[PDB]
Design a protein around this ligand. Sequence first.
Ligand SMILES: CN(C)c1ccc(C(=O)NCCCCCCC(=O)NO)cc1
Ligand SMILES: [K+]
Ligand SMILES: [K+]
Ligand SMILES: [Zn+2]
Length: 356
Amino acid sequence: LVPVYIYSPEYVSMCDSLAKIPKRASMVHSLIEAYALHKQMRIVKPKVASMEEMATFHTDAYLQHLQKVSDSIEYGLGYACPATEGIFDYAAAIGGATITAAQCLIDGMCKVAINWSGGWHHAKKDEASGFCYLNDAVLGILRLRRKFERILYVDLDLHHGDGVEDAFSFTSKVMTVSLHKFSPGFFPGTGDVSDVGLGKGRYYSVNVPIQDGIQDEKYYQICESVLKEVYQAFNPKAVVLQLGADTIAGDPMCSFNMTPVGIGKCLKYILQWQLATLILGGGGYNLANTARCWTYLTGVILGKTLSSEIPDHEFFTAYGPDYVLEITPSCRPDRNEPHRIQQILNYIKGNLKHVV
Ligand SMILES: CN(C)c1ccc(C(=O)NCCCCCCC(=O)NO)cc1
Ligand SMILES: [K+]
Ligand SMILES: [K+]
Ligand SMILES: [Zn+2]
């Protein structure tokens, strides 16, 4: 009944090697440890993923190439996803870390597993995208299929989880839900409310397009509402939740305007179903704030309520100028006309009827 935590000094150091977010893993783990939250969790070392396990989703041609590299401009290995030395070993560690976490759920060893360094949702079966060379969220879902018959994927990252959606857009065994910013020119440019899946998977893909400024209350209402209709019509067996913190105020991305307390309520709501739950990270470019967010969340997963003062630890200096765990919203307008949010929620409502 104690949450599993995918930790390991070799793993955390492996993660800190990704140039896009230098040292974010240490910072997150460290802050979580400074609150001594690992004290109330089942620390589990992650096993590196095998070439046969990655092959359950990615193609050999792609996997062979990722390896060779560790005409790249043919697999999406360029600006966003560089042909860096070691990415292969890097991806394997993150894929295996999520697979290792999934196995625990299908062994009753716990009702919740955590891997903050995971959540790379943009990767396609044979192509790297938006900083992702391998899709651990899919590997994790394909692993949960072994025991669970209906998996629900909720993506709370600032960006549309296109990679995971495409992977399952033709099936009704796995349903994806994504609340993300949608606007022309904003990566990856997919996921409008009209997007609902294809073929035998029609309606088993839910997309909530949102605009800048949205704050905690407006966001929870929207999320709580949709997660409601979905638990109704789908009646999931297990849940995979991606929690990219690039939605939180202060992120250089400067779009949404959330705080960890908003996402927290959404997390509570999902945990209330007591279904098996695999927690993942994702985007998050204000390093200190990402740690503030995932630590607080690790805290709602445990029922505990953390101190407002940031405990002294290796990265204590990065929490200035106030040195607290709370995040204050920025002073800028919510651009979500309340009438459009309703149109969308109805359009959703209607679409869920079609489910069994
Ligand atoms: C120098 N600098 C600040 C940047 C340079 C390039 C990009 C970019 O290509 N972006 C497109 C892909 C963005 C990936 C977002 C990953 C994510 O959060 N997914 O949810 C961005 C910033
Ligand atoms: K689907
Ligand atoms: K999202
Ligand atoms: Zn993101």
